[PDB]
Enzyme design. Sequence first.
Site, PDB file in Angstrom:
ATOM      1  N   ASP A 168     151.409 118.560  55.582  1.00  0.00           N
ATOM      2  CA  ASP A 168     150.451 118.934  56.634  1.00  0.00           C
ATOM      3  C   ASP A 168     150.704 120.309  57.246  1.00  0.00           C
ATOM      4  O   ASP A 168     149.849 120.831  57.961  1.00  0.00           O
ATOM      5  CB  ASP A 168     150.464 117.908  57.764  1.00  0.00           C
ATOM      6  N   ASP A 181     153.334 106.951  57.837  1.00  0.00           N
ATOM      7  CA  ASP A 181     152.650 108.000  58.592  1.00  0.00           C
ATOM      8  C   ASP A 181     152.227 107.386  59.915  1.00  0.00           C
ATOM      9  O   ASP A 181     151.725 106.251  59.951  1.00  0.00           O
ATOM     10  CB  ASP A 181     151.435 108.495  57.791  1.00  0.00           C
ATOM     11  N   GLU A 237     157.655 108.285  60.429  1.00  0.00           N
ATOM     12  CA  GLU A 237     157.027 109.574  60.705  1.00  0.00           C
ATOM     13  C   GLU A 237     156.787 109.614  62.202  1.00  0.00           C
ATOM     14  O   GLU A 237     155.813 109.057  62.699  1.00  0.00           O
ATOM     15  CB  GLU A 237     155.720 109.746  59.929  1.00  0.00           C
TER      16      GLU A 237
HETATM   17  C1  LIG Z   1     149.019 111.233  58.057  1.00  0.00           C
HETATM   18  O1  LIG Z   1     147.724 110.690  58.098  1.00  0.00           O
HETATM   19  C2  LIG Z   1     146.704 111.625  58.409  1.00  0.00           C
HETATM   20  C3  LIG Z   1     145.413 110.872  58.737  1.00  0.00           C
HETATM   21  O2  LIG Z   1     144.912 110.201  57.592  1.00  0.00           O
HETATM   22  C4  LIG Z   1     146.606 112.583  57.230  1.00  0.00           C
HETATM   23  O3  LIG Z   1     145.512 113.459  57.470  1.00  0.00           O
HETATM   24  C5  LIG Z   1     144.867 114.017  56.318  1.00  0.00           C
HETATM   25  O4  LIG Z   1     144.022 113.056  55.653  1.00  0.00           O
HETATM   26  C6  LIG Z   1     142.858 112.665  56.379  1.00  0.00           C
HETATM   27  C7  LIG Z   1     142.126 111.578  55.595  1.00  0.00           C
HETATM   28  C8  LIG Z   1     142.012 113.932  56.606  1.00  0.00           C
HETATM   29  N1  LIG Z   1     140.669 113.698  57.120  1.00  0.00           N
HETATM   30  C9  LIG Z   1     140.393 112.869  58.279  1.00  0.00           C
HETATM   31  C10 LIG Z   1     140.470 113.704  59.541  1.00  0.00           C
HETATM   32  C11 LIG Z   1     139.416 113.957  60.342  1.00  0.00           C
HETATM   33  C12 LIG Z   1     139.597 114.818  61.583  1.00  0.00           C
HETATM   34  O5  LIG Z   1     140.972 115.027  61.895  1.00  0.00           O
HETATM   35  C13 LIG Z   1     138.041 113.417  60.043  1.00  0.00           C
HETATM   36  O6  LIG Z   1     137.065 114.406  60.386  1.00  0.00           O
HETATM   37  C14 LIG Z   1     137.881 113.030  58.578  1.00  0.00           C
HETATM   38  O7  LIG Z   1     136.675 112.297  58.419  1.00  0.00           O
HETATM   39  C15 LIG Z   1     139.040 112.174  58.099  1.00  0.00           C
HETATM   40  O8  LIG Z   1     138.818 111.838  56.731  1.00  0.00           O
HETATM   41  C16 LIG Z   1     142.798 114.881  57.515  1.00  0.00           C
HETATM   42  O9  LIG Z   1     142.022 116.034  57.850  1.00  0.00           O
HETATM   43  C17 LIG Z   1     144.105 115.253  56.810  1.00  0.00           C
HETATM   44  O10 LIG Z   1     144.949 115.958  57.711  1.00  0.00           O
HETATM   45  C18 LIG Z   1     147.923 113.353  57.138  1.00  0.00           C
HETATM   46  O11 LIG Z   1     147.907 114.234  56.029  1.00  0.00           O
HETATM   47  C19 LIG Z   1     149.094 112.383  57.020  1.00  0.00           C
HETATM   48  O12 LIG Z   1     150.348 113.036  57.165  1.00  0.00           O
HETATM   49  O1  LIG Z   2     147.957 114.399  60.691  1.00  0.00           O
HETATM   50  C1  LIG Z   2     149.208 115.055  60.935  1.00  0.00           C
HETATM   51  C2  LIG Z   2     149.931 114.430  62.125  1.00  0.00           C
HETATM   52  C3  LIG Z   2     150.414 113.041  61.729  1.00  0.00           C
HETATM   53  C4  LIG Z   2     151.114 112.363  62.894  1.00  0.00           C
HETATM   54  O2  LIG Z   2     151.296 110.978  62.593  1.00  0.00           O
HETATM   55  C5  LIG Z   2     150.314 112.430  64.185  1.00  0.00           C
HETATM   56  O3  LIG Z   2     151.225 112.156  65.255  1.00  0.00           O
HETATM   57  C6  LIG Z   2     149.595 113.761  64.439  1.00  0.00           C
HETATM   58  O4  LIG Z   2     150.512 114.666  65.064  1.00  0.00           O
HETATM   59  O5  LIG Z   2     149.052 114.359  63.251  1.00  0.00           O
END
Ligand SMILES: *[C@@H]1O[C@H](CO)[C@@H](O[C@H]2O[C@H](C)[C@@H](N[C@H]3C=C(CO)[C@@H](O)[C@H](O)[C@H]3O)[C@H](O)[C@H]2O)[C@H](O)[C@H]1O
Ligand SMILES: OC[C@@H]1C[C@H](O)[C@@H](O)[C@@H](O)O1
Length: 499
Positions: free
Chosen positions: A394, A293, A340
């Site tokens: 996502d 990712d 990714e």
């Molecule tokens: C790629 O990686 C992404 C980042 O980890 C992932 O995102 C999901 O998982 C996160 C842990 C989640 N929460 C964080 C995001 C925030 C704001 O954008 C903060 O407020 C939180 O404290 C964090 O914990 C994401 O919301 C969630 O999308 C992707 O799924 C993955 O593809």
């Molecule tokens: O969290 C969903 C995506 C993952 C990706 O790595 C980042 O480029 C952004 O677009 O958010």
Amino acid sequence: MELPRAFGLLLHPTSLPGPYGVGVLGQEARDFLRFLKEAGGRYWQVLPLGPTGYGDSPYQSFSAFAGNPYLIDLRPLAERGYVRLEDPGFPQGRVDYGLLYAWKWPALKEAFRGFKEKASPEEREAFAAFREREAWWLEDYALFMALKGAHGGLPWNRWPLPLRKREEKALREAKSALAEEVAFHAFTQWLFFRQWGALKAEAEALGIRIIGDMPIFVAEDSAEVWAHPEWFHLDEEGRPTVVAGVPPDYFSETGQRWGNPLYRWDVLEREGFSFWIRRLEKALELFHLVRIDHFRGFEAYWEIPASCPTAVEGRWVKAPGEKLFQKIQEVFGEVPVLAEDLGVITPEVEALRDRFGLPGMKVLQFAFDXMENPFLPHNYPAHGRVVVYTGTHDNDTTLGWYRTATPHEKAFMARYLADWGITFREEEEVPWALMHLGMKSVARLAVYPVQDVLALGSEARMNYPGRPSGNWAWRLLPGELSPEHGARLRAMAEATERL
Ligand SMILES: *[C@@H]1O[C@H](CO)[C@@H](O[C@H]2O[C@H](C)[C@@H](N[C@H]3C=C(CO)[C@@H](O)[C@H](O)[C@H]3O)[C@H](O)[C@H]2O)[C@H](O)[C@H]1O
Ligand SMILES: OC[C@@H]1C[C@H](O)[C@@H](O)[C@@H](O)O1
């Protein structure tokens, strides 16, 4: 790495059907692999499989190495008399993580006490052997988890300083005092990796390869961060001075403020990148292909000041991706990784990706909002080394996405599909029309979320990025994924040279 022309399905194990509140590594998982084989599928994609905390996200785990105890099948343990299982009333079609938390942890602890009571000497020795073998991360993980019960579930960087700073005596005393709790967490890991290894062997017998996933950035409250604070941008109290995320997007006006600690890449390089070698090693024990990712983070990452509540303030900082992947290559041989590469991608990210032969991704939900769009099949690389999705975990389900799509997107999608010979009458048919388009394309691998096979709406969406709650909860109902779905997948793969 040689990718054949094929298709696969994206299904996190939690989403499997079955009793006791969550999908697990047992019979229903075996049934899914059988379904996948008969559908002509050759790939199973999952999300990260580590232990989750608040939010229940695979992408923010208490360990980069540990397996998720919620994925442990308790039935084999019940058969051996270690535990008595009773259904408390889990819902249909979703994980109730609150009830799962309340019921599954005690059930696991009860199984552990039953195991210590009734387990044959052979099982005790196997468990002990596993512990010795995995000690290099397992000792830290089990103690990290054990210490949360001693300190109200606080994150490591809020623990008393002697523990926080990993003083030798403090650690020794803790390991002694929490010996049983440490052993229980070790036991959850032994069971996870045994059950996963069994399931991996089953996949292998059926000609199925498992695509795993690893976030580039690890979680703030995690055992490895606690064990190696010098590898991260933390202050004297162990708190991040800067955090991970992505800048004010086209999508998000303030961005995504992920919150993860950022690497001190200079320190990692001097240290020899051992964390990354180990991560990839461990991933390759569990998976045949691993996706990373946010691959662009190896070239450059958005550095957000900790005192900024959104992702608007910050800067791009260069990372030694070239150095890291040279090291991976000279030590592993051939990079079995998928990039990714969604979001804002520059020529420098693409060249790093292409230099190491890494397949990137394409998402069809993004393809119709403007003919030069890179997510349109006719713009894919001639060499075909890409993975095409309708949507990822996502994205919304494809039917959900279509219902909120702009009029121009919908009109262009229909026309573009028609250019490829693909037509539909009902909006519920759009997921399969887009799956057909992906399969017609030159992408070596077409991987589709099971929700799109079922043509489910937005209620079956796995994650909504930005929202902290309601995510990672979708589950299959028993029988929902039918022999007819499989036959339709098989016909499509046959019709597009993917079988
Ligand atoms: C790629 O990686 C992404 C980042 O980890 C992932 O995102 C999901 O998982 C996160 C842990 C989640 N929460 C964080 C995001 C925030 C704001 O954008 C903060 O407020 C939180 O404290 C964090 O914990 C994401 O919301 C969630 O999308 C992707 O799924 C993955 O593809
Ligand atoms: O969290 C969903 C995506 C993952 C990706 O790595 C980042 O480029 C952004 O677009 O958010």
